[PDB]
Symmetry: C3
Subunit: 378 residues, 3 copies
């Protein structure tokens, strides 16, 4: 059903939210990033009975998917009372479950073990499924995070893609996520505006990396301080020249092959491009289908995998916006990155304060023990 | 008087600033946050004599209150010269006084002692008064800050509200600050637009907290590492379910009741709401009065305490904007929070660098003592 | 020539980029800050042959200067294909060369030595020239940075001004950079809008500074912890009174004269002003010339040195915007400052983690020495 079903916070009453301003309705999806619906509801005679129920923590069913309202803005301008509703997919509500226990130390985990640890003894009825092949990732002191943080960690590390059937989270890989379809994007046929953002500020074709630190680091000079020092040069240098970046240091590995693969992962030697298409066709576009893009004036004839969708209501007459190959820069993204880096630095210095305090604790005890030993020497 | 009195930086000449664009005039107040007036002045024949005096560091008297100009923007477009004046209440100028001395160590202070320490030997003629009851707060190495920083620390810790009669700062509590009044806000009578912003992204009802660390922490497992470990569950869970938050750690307390009250203070279990009212009545609204709000279509019949005012000049014909129950999100607030967190992290790293260096300094002397004892043993 | 010359990434074909939307063309310069050109190109018959060549990493010659394209935005709206081109001066491409070697320790360098170290064994054909006199600056572990970072460090430390003839970077000082000219800015003659931004939020006339830390810091009390403690008071206090700021600590000097000069450098005792002029005269304005500003209504009769230019194409009919005495506040600058402070804090904590681990590592050797001595004494 294309209409919205409203279920109250206490789940006592469930009805149909009518007279929604479908022109303002919008559904936003971005892989591993967001899944939400936003609209505006005006209080009229048809929905006056249930207009008081729509609020924060209410549930909206739309196209078989459940969204929890996370921001409600009632507004009264004369005779019109309007609520601006924003609801996120119920999967993100898994952040309300926190795994306090910590698996201390460095250990090689798989996606299955981390997912089982994250969603152990859930009280919100959350379940997970895995469909694909993923490598092993070594992690330090896993735990002490909420469910959403651990899910995001899994997505970032194992390179998985998460999609939720209400409260059941499926984790695919790149191979099993995208499905090929015969639907295609054609210039002048079903597309209006096509934009390509290309950036080459981080185009680097050379990198130098250092491994762990030798015990006699002070006694040694130069790259001899590390058992693993490697310089990686990308083949793209042949078309871009030598563009070397600032050195990155990993202090957890000792051999050279791991350093080489890490250095290869540490740079980006292809121009960063983001594609945006304004689509106004009749065929619906899902979150998994791969389309064929043909646009002669822009010199495009390829296969495009959808990574971002900004759809309107089917009755809203508006266009659809579809993204490929990551998203445009945007400023709030930069602010979020800075904020998370700040949080990481804050927790790091909080840990280092305790570490330095204990550095005095282990000092005096052994001082006393060996001073007693020295007295025994006398 | 409703007009503005301009006194020069050197206080040689004090006159009346006329021909002020009262339509652009605005007075902004927010409790413990801001108190300022902003407007625009055009150079005309009436104020040509004193138009050169209005500038940075000049004093403006408005309704018996003194504001120091902190931002002046002269602008020339043909024959019209305009200055955009922004002035902050003179109380904030107390930030020009810095208390360099530090009361090192952890100690339980009252508001009176901290206020006396902050404004000791002032050369700007600042005085303070306290009206209310406040608890005792334990602080570390109080001092080495300007007057405004210590005042903000007092406001944040003791839960006081600061209001300034020019250069005399009164510190009230919630009980003695708000005064009940018979004035009321009525829908369709003196209000035009009413907005309520509701957020439930921090709705948490369960928290786990850890106390100090035991001396034999490394040889202990789990919560045994701390003498104080407690899980606090809010009653609101009965209407919201279990929503665990990330664990918060306090390393300065040992018992369980203090950790319980700290954990209770550490979460927020009600929807975060902010109310904004556009008022166009004849009765003026002050910064302390508590009104009665009645708005049937939005289901309001309560008492509202003013926390933010954006008033216009009495001749400006414009509406007034009044806020209750904290303010809307906004980005500049987020940027200020991020900046202050960055500064705190930077100073923490600066202190910890010296701490590690003196750990190396306290190292070698004790190594020398050990060597002396070793030689004595032989 | 006033038109744009386009040279492909592979330098195979070099032609003239015609049908450029000169109305959108803009050239932005700011001393030690930026040098770039931005415009928009529409695909027409006159340039359809070479419209595919203009893209990222292409080279544009404009008025004898080379700019590398760093952001290209092809766009298709119906029958018009447009590319939004932003190109930075080729000098900044020197950031593609990284000096991995580090000159560890604290040492007094000159500008010549640092510049030679930065551009040693360049593969991009970069050369440097120095014209002026600069003092000696002491630095720690110079190196491990790209060319642009070291150039910016030189500009910030030695107080130099960088101007590039394509790939040849000239470094002047204040004396040899600005050249006096007879061209003047006159009110009502060749200027339209003149704006002055004045801020006095950081107006401080007193500061207290502490030198290095004594070895018996814990055994000593107060300012005796430092061999160098000095309070600097600016003469401008006579116009503004005492406005003392938060104390700044330098832990690398021991005498009092260096602390005094550092404290003098640490505060600003004059209002921070920024001047902007809209110029519409026939005489072109360069990046070095010093003009004479006369504006009676705003009380200006002085010499103004250009620090920022926003010029249009000579055929664009638009005004020119010229800045003096630093630039307006803006937010993106604040975000850049916050981001670089975050990066500095991150590298500081990354270094101090290894430092603390070494402190733990350095403990075990001395524990072994104590044990051996205890055994020997017995």
């Amino acid at each position: 059903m294309d209409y919205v079903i409203i279920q109250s916070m206490d789940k006592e009453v469930e009805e149909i939210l009518t007279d929604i301003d479908y022109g303002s309705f919008s559904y936003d999806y971005e892989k591993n990033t967001s899944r939400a619906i936003s609209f505006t509801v005006n209080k009229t005679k048809q929905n006056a009975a249930i207009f008081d129920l729509v609020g924060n923590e209410a549930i909206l069913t739309y196209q078989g998917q459940q969204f929890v309202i996370k921001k409600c803005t009632p507004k009264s301008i004369g005779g019109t009372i309007s609520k601006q509703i924003t609801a996120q997919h119920i999967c993100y509500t898994v952040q309300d479950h926190v795994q306090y226990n910590v698996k201390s130390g460095r250990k090689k985990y798989s996606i299955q073990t981390v997912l089982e640890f994250a969603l152990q003894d859930n009280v919100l009825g959350f379940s997970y499924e895995i469909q694909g092949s993923f490598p092993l990732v070594e992690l330090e002191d896993l735990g002490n995070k909420n469910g959403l943080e651990l899910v995001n960690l899994c997505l970032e590390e194992f390179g998985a893609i998460l999609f939720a059937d209400n409260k059941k989270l499926y984790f695919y890989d790149e191979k099993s996520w995208y499905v090929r379809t015969e639907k295609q994007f054609r210039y002048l046929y079903n597309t209006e505006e096509v934009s390509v953002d290309t950036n080459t500020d981080n185009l680097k074709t050379e990198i130098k990396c250092y491994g762990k630190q030798k015990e006699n680091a002070d006694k040694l000079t130069g790259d001899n301080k590390y058992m693993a020092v490697v310089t990686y040069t990308s083949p793209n240098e042949a078309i871009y020249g030598k563009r070397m970046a600032n050195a990155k240091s990993d202090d957890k590995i000792t051999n050279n092959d791991d350093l080489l693969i890490f250095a290869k992962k540490q740079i980006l030697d292809v121009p960063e491009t983001a594609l945006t298409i304004a689509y106004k066709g009749k065929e619906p576009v899902s979150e998994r289908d791969v389309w064929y893009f043909i646009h002669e004036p822009m010199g495009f004839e390829t296969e495009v995998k959808v990574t971002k969708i900004k759809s309107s209501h089917p009755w809203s007459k508006k266009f659809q916006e579809i993204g490929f190959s990551n998203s445009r820069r945007d400023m709030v993204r930069i602010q979020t990155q800075i904020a998370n880096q700040v949080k990481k630095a804050s927790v790091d210095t909080n840990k280092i304060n305790s570490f330095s305090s204990i550095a005095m604790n282990a000092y005096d005890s052994r001082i006393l023990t060996e001073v007693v030993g020295v007295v025994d020497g006398d």
